[PDB]
Short mmCIF file of C-alpha atoms in Angstrom, two decimals:
data_model
loop_
_atom_site.label_atom_id
_atom_site.label_comp_id
_atom_site.label_asym_id
_atom_site.label_seq_id
_atom_site.Cartn_x
_atom_site.Cartn_y
_atom_site.Cartn_z
CA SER A 815 -22.93 13.84 55.99
CA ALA A 816 -22.91 11.89 59.70
CA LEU A 817 -22.91 8.86 57.79
CA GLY A 818 -20.25 9.39 55.53
CA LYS A 819 -17.82 6.48 56.74
CA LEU A 820 -20.43 4.15 56.02
CA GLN A 821 -21.60 5.61 52.79
CA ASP A 822 -18.28 6.16 50.82
CA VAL A 823 -17.17 2.68 51.24
CA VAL A 824 -20.54 1.55 49.44
CA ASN A 825 -19.75 4.37 46.87
CA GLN A 826 -16.40 3.52 46.08
CA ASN A 827 -17.13 -0.16 45.84
CA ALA A 828 -20.27 0.46 43.32
CA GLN A 829 -17.74 2.95 41.30
CA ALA A 830 -15.27 0.36 41.38
CA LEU A 831 -17.63 -2.06 39.88
CA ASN A 832 -19.07 0.46 37.45
CA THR A 833 -15.46 1.27 36.40
CA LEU A 834 -14.74 -2.49 36.14
CA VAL A 835 -18.10 -2.99 33.77
CA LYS A 836 -17.58 0.41 31.62
CA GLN A 837 -14.04 -1.28 30.73
CA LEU A 838 -16.26 -3.53 28.38
CA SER A 839 -16.80 -1.20 25.47
CA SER A 840 -13.00 -1.13 24.44
CA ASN A 841 -11.41 -2.96 21.52
CA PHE A 842 -7.96 -1.84 22.92
CA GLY A 843 -6.43 -0.91 19.63
CA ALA A 844 -7.97 -3.31 17.22
CA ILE A 845 -10.75 -2.20 14.25
CA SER A 846 -14.13 -2.80 16.26
CA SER A 847 -15.17 -3.74 19.32
CA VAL A 848 -17.47 -6.91 18.02
CA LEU A 849 -14.99 -9.74 17.91
CA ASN A 850 -15.78 -11.50 14.70
CA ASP A 851 -15.17 -8.23 12.75
CA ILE A 852 -11.78 -8.17 14.28
CA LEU A 853 -11.05 -11.69 13.57
CA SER A 854 -12.93 -13.62 11.01
CA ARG A 855 -12.19 -12.37 7.58
CA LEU A 856 -8.66 -11.54 8.63
CA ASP A 857 -6.43 -14.31 8.01
CA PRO A 858 -6.00 -16.06 11.50
CA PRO A 859 -2.13 -15.82 11.76
CA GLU A 860 -2.65 -12.12 11.38
CA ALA A 861 -5.78 -11.34 13.84
CA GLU A 862 -4.46 -13.05 16.97
CA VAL A 863 -2.36 -9.84 17.93
CA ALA B 496 -14.03 3.60 -15.09
CA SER B 497 -10.55 4.12 -14.46
CA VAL B 498 -8.80 4.91 -10.87
CA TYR B 499 -8.92 8.96 -11.30
CA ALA B 500 -12.58 8.62 -11.41
CA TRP B 501 -13.44 5.45 -9.47
CA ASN B 502 -17.25 4.35 -9.42
CA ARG B 503 -19.10 4.21 -6.47
CA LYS B 504 -22.41 2.41 -6.79
CA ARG B 505 -24.05 1.74 -3.63
CA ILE B 506 -26.35 -1.08 -3.03
CA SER B 507 -29.50 -1.14 -0.73
CA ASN B 508 -32.58 -2.78 0.17
CA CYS B 509 -31.86 -6.38 -1.18
CA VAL B 510 -30.74 -9.73 -0.37
CA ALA B 511 -27.22 -10.46 -1.22
CA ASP B 512 -25.85 -13.88 -1.39
CA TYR B 513 -22.07 -14.06 -1.40
CA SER B 514 -21.95 -17.55 -1.84
CA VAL B 515 -22.18 -17.23 -5.33
CA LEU B 516 -19.53 -14.78 -5.39
CA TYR B 517 -16.93 -16.74 -3.46
CA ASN B 518 -17.40 -20.38 -5.52
CA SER B 519 -16.65 -18.46 -8.91
CA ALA B 520 -13.17 -19.25 -9.99
CA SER B 521 -12.77 -16.34 -12.42
CA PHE B 522 -11.31 -13.99 -9.60
CA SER B 523 -7.78 -13.70 -9.04
CA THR B 524 -7.52 -12.70 -5.47
CA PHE B 525 -10.02 -12.17 -2.72
CA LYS B 526 -8.60 -10.30 -0.33
CA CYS B 527 -11.28 -9.53 2.61
CA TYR B 528 -10.72 -7.84 6.17
CA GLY B 529 -13.97 -7.76 7.97
CA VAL B 530 -16.06 -10.64 9.26
CA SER B 531 -15.73 -14.60 7.52
CA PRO B 532 -16.69 -15.19 4.25
CA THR B 533 -18.06 -18.45 5.10
CA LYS B 534 -20.63 -16.23 7.22
CA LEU B 535 -21.25 -13.39 4.76
CA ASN B 536 -24.33 -15.12 3.76
CA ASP B 537 -24.98 -15.45 8.16
CA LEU B 538 -24.87 -11.33 8.32
CA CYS B 539 -26.76 -8.30 7.67
CA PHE B 540 -25.45 -4.96 6.52
CA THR B 541 -26.47 -1.29 6.34
CA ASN B 542 -24.33 0.00 3.22
CA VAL B 543 -22.67 -1.76 0.72
CA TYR B 544 -20.81 1.14 -1.44
CA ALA B 545 -19.42 -1.01 -4.34
CA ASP B 546 -16.54 0.46 -6.38
CA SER B 547 -15.41 -0.49 -9.67
CA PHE B 548 -12.22 0.68 -11.22
CA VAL B 549 -9.19 -0.80 -13.26
CA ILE B 550 -5.62 -0.79 -11.79
CA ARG B 551 -2.21 -2.18 -13.29
CA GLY B 552 -1.27 -5.57 -12.84
CA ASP B 553 1.38 -4.96 -10.87
CA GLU B 554 -0.98 -2.65 -8.31
CA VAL B 555 -2.59 -5.30 -6.69
CA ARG B 556 -0.77 -5.05 -3.41
CA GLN B 557 -1.32 -1.14 -3.29
CA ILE B 558 -5.30 -2.24 -2.29
CA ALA B 559 -5.00 -2.66 1.40
CA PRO B 560 -5.45 -0.69 4.72
CA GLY B 561 -2.39 1.79 4.60
CA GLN B 562 -0.70 1.35 1.34
CA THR B 563 2.20 3.60 -0.22
CA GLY B 564 1.76 4.43 -4.02
CA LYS B 565 0.56 6.89 -6.62
CA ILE B 566 -2.68 5.12 -6.41
CA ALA B 567 -2.59 4.89 -2.76
CA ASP B 568 -1.19 7.82 -1.47
CA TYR B 569 -2.12 10.41 -4.21
CA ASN B 570 -5.24 8.85 -6.48
CA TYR B 571 -7.25 5.96 -4.22
CA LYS B 572 -6.60 5.82 -0.45
CA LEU B 573 -8.37 3.07 1.62
CA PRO B 574 -8.33 3.83 5.65
CA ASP B 575 -6.66 1.97 7.94
CA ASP B 576 -9.98 0.39 9.68
CA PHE B 577 -11.37 -0.76 6.04
CA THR B 578 -13.81 -3.63 6.52
CA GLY B 579 -14.60 -5.04 3.04
CA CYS B 580 -13.42 -7.77 0.18
CA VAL B 581 -11.36 -6.90 -2.50
CA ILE B 582 -12.29 -9.10 -5.78
CA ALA B 583 -10.07 -8.89 -8.60
CA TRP B 584 -9.56 -10.37 -11.96
CA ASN B 585 -7.74 -10.00 -15.09
CA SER B 586 -9.07 -8.06 -17.69
CA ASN B 587 -6.17 -8.33 -20.38
CA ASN B 588 -9.06 -9.90 -23.18
CA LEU B 589 -11.15 -6.62 -22.46
CA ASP B 590 -9.17 -4.02 -22.62
CA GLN C 1411 17.59 10.61 -4.41
CA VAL C 1412 15.78 8.73 -7.19
CA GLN C 1413 16.75 9.93 -10.54
CA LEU C 1414 16.64 8.61 -14.18
CA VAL C 1415 18.70 9.89 -16.79
CA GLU C 1416 18.56 9.16 -20.49
CA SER C 1417 21.49 9.09 -23.05
CA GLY C 1418 22.24 7.07 -26.37
CA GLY C 1419 19.93 9.27 -28.91
CA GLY C 1420 20.90 10.64 -32.15
CA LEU C 1421 19.63 11.33 -35.52
CA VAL C 1422 19.41 8.00 -37.74
CA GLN C 1423 17.66 7.11 -41.23
CA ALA C 1424 14.69 4.49 -42.05
CA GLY C 1425 16.43 0.95 -40.79
CA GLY C 1426 19.02 2.38 -38.65
CA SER C 1427 19.77 1.12 -35.26
CA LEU C 1428 20.63 2.85 -32.05
CA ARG C 1429 20.86 1.94 -28.63
CA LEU C 1430 19.35 4.18 -25.55
CA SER C 1431 20.15 3.88 -21.64
CA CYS C 1432 18.73 4.79 -18.53
CA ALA C 1433 21.05 5.08 -15.84
CA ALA C 1434 19.11 5.07 -12.32
CA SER C 1435 20.19 6.16 -8.77
CA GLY C 1436 19.04 5.96 -5.46
CA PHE C 1437 17.34 2.33 -5.96
CA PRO C 1438 18.55 -1.16 -6.97
CA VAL C 1439 17.01 -2.19 -10.22
CA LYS C 1440 16.55 -6.15 -8.86
CA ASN C 1441 13.53 -5.05 -7.03
CA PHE C 1442 11.05 -2.88 -9.20
CA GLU C 1443 9.54 -3.15 -12.81
CA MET C 1444 10.69 -1.09 -16.03
CA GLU C 1445 8.99 0.61 -18.46
CA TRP C 1446 9.56 2.62 -21.25
CA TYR C 1447 7.34 5.04 -22.55
CA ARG C 1448 7.56 7.36 -25.86
CA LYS C 1449 6.23 10.84 -26.79
CA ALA C 1450 5.84 11.47 -30.92
CA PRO C 1451 4.98 15.31 -32.03
CA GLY C 1452 1.30 15.70 -31.81
CA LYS C 1453 0.82 12.07 -30.37
CA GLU C 1454 -0.49 10.70 -27.09
CA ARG C 1455 2.44 9.38 -24.60
CA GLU C 1456 2.50 5.15 -25.37
CA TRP C 1457 4.03 2.40 -23.54
CA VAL C 1458 6.97 0.62 -25.28
CA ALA C 1459 8.13 -1.99 -23.57
CA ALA C 1460 8.46 -3.90 -20.11
CA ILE C 1461 10.38 -6.20 -17.97
CA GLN C 1462 9.43 -7.49 -14.44
CA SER C 1463 11.02 -6.96 -11.15
CA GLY C 1464 12.25 -10.71 -11.16
CA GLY C 1465 13.86 -10.13 -14.57
CA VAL C 1466 11.84 -12.78 -16.16
CA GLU C 1467 9.17 -11.59 -18.57
CA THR C 1468 9.61 -9.41 -21.26
CA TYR C 1469 6.49 -7.42 -22.67
CA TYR C 1470 6.25 -4.99 -25.78
CA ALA C 1471 3.67 -2.67 -27.43
CA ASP C 1472 1.53 -3.92 -30.36
CA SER C 1473 3.38 -2.51 -33.13
CA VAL C 1474 7.14 -3.09 -31.72
CA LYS C 1475 6.65 -6.67 -31.24
CA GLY C 1476 9.67 -8.48 -32.96
CA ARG C 1477 11.75 -5.59 -33.91
CA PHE C 1478 12.48 -3.74 -30.34
CA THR C 1479 15.02 -5.54 -27.47
CA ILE C 1480 15.03 -4.40 -24.05
CA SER C 1481 17.90 -5.24 -21.77
CA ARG C 1482 18.56 -4.55 -18.16
CA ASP C 1483 21.89 -4.22 -16.58
CA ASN C 1484 21.60 -5.07 -12.50
CA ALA C 1485 25.94 -4.33 -11.95
CA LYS C 1486 25.77 -0.82 -13.68
CA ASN C 1487 22.24 0.31 -12.66
CA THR C 1488 21.14 1.12 -15.99
CA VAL C 1489 18.59 0.00 -18.49
CA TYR C 1490 18.99 -0.07 -22.24
CA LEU C 1491 16.79 -0.20 -24.93
CA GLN C 1492 17.92 -1.46 -28.56
CA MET C 1493 16.31 -0.24 -32.04
CA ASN C 1494 16.44 -2.57 -34.71
CA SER C 1495 14.09 -2.06 -38.11
CA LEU C 1496 13.50 1.36 -37.70
CA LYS C 1497 10.68 3.23 -39.22
CA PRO C 1498 9.91 7.32 -38.97
CA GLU C 1499 6.51 6.68 -36.89
CA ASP C 1500 8.81 5.94 -34.03
CA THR C 1501 9.77 9.65 -34.14
CA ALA C 1502 9.77 10.45 -30.58
CA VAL C 1503 11.13 11.30 -27.50
CA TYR C 1504 11.81 8.27 -25.16
CA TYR C 1505 11.09 8.33 -21.64
CA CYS C 1506 12.14 5.33 -18.81
CA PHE C 1507 9.50 4.81 -16.45
CA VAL C 1508 10.11 2.92 -12.82
CA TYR C 1509 7.51 3.03 -10.26
CA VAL C 1510 9.89 3.07 -7.18
CA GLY C 1511 6.85 4.55 -4.29
CA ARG C 1512 5.63 6.81 -6.46
CA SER C 1513 6.94 6.80 -10.48
CA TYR C 1514 9.43 9.03 -11.61
CA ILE C 1515 9.67 10.41 -15.30
CA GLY C 1516 13.32 11.74 -16.81
CA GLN C 1517 13.63 14.27 -19.29
CA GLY C 1518 13.99 11.98 -22.12
CA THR C 1519 16.50 11.90 -25.08
CA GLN C 1520 15.07 12.59 -28.95
CA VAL C 1521 15.25 10.05 -30.98
CA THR C 1522 14.09 10.88 -34.79
CA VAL C 1523 14.00 8.42 -37.77
CA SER C 1524 14.64 9.73 -41.16
CA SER D 934 21.00 7.65 61.53
CA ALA D 935 18.21 8.49 64.45
CA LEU D 936 15.88 9.56 62.11
CA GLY D 937 15.82 6.58 59.68
CA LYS D 938 11.73 6.06 60.36
CA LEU D 939 11.07 9.25 58.33
CA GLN D 940 14.41 9.06 55.83
CA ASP D 941 12.97 5.44 54.13
CA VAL D 942 9.74 6.93 53.37
CA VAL D 943 10.94 10.07 51.62
CA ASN D 944 13.92 7.48 50.01
CA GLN D 945 11.25 5.43 48.89
CA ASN D 946 8.96 7.65 47.38
CA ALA D 947 12.04 9.30 45.74
CA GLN D 948 12.75 6.19 44.27
CA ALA D 949 9.60 5.27 43.22
CA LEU D 950 9.32 8.53 41.04
CA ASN D 951 12.65 8.08 39.77
CA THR D 952 11.86 4.67 38.74
CA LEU D 953 8.60 5.89 37.18
CA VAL D 954 10.90 8.28 35.15
CA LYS D 955 13.59 5.85 34.27
CA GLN D 956 10.88 3.43 32.91
CA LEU D 957 10.40 6.23 29.98
CA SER D 958 13.67 5.41 28.10
CA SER D 959 12.39 1.61 27.67
CA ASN D 960 11.57 0.38 23.87
CA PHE D 961 9.41 -2.65 25.43
CA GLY D 962 10.45 -4.22 22.14
CA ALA D 963 11.05 -1.22 20.07
CA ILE D 964 13.65 0.18 17.61
CA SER D 965 13.28 3.86 19.68
CA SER D 966 12.02 4.76 22.80
CA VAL D 967 10.97 8.31 21.38
CA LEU D 968 7.60 8.49 19.48
CA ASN D 969 8.93 10.78 17.08
CA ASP D 970 11.49 8.74 15.00
CA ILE D 971 8.91 6.28 15.04
CA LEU D 972 6.44 8.15 13.30
CA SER D 973 8.83 9.54 10.93
CA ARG D 974 10.96 6.35 9.98
CA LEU D 975 7.93 3.85 10.05
CA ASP D 976 4.71 3.96 7.84
CA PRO D 977 1.69 4.63 10.36
CA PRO D 978 -0.24 1.38 10.13
CA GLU D 979 3.02 -1.03 10.86
CA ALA D 980 3.95 1.70 13.39
CA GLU D 981 0.72 1.36 15.40
CA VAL D 982 2.10 -2.17 16.66
#
């Protein structure tokens, strides 16, 4: 724990980057996380929401 | 079979051409939900779960995600996350 | 909130005429399709007549085409049914039918032809 | 008013938490800001939006 002032910066940078990448498994409220399975059999004035 | 005992006939281990089913003009409505009917011939599926029933002619708009009705709320309910096509045609000449 | 009540029934002979009513509450009748069914004793419940929600087209059952008349009154919130050329095969309890969310059935009125 | 450099910090934090509280009563385009009459008076797939 001597080098903690260097280590916590790299830890919070890597964990912020991992939290950014772990956002990529979310449809945010859609039916599925696949873009085409949201959009393309639904009518195009009603999948844009 | 009618809507209290709606038939579930699953389809597996074959090649499903949906361009034949698209270009047939006998069907009245072709309401669809998941992924495009142009590329229905282009993708591959795990299961089909094809269904078969007869409704009233005014009960066409009950077959949607989250409707209300004695068909919808008491007999035959679709999920809100339903991915499929509704294929319907008139059967006054057969029933 | 939604309730159908039926009146206008009575005892008639073979070839008599009568006119029923189906007074409705809780919903307007310019938006829903309207039907009538009848229950003969010893027979199943069978559909009689229908007018759609727009009020444009009329339909009837196979044995009652050309003889029965269905009419609607949107002002009084009442649907009527007219009898002409009555036969004793139509001895039944007549229920009026509508689908307002879920279908509601009234208690009906006994109409006998003898 | 000699102690303003401590009082403004407490006032800023209290106004931040009170502004966080007072935006719970915002519709953001809704009929009502309470979930229960949204769930009661509206059909649940079109209450989802």
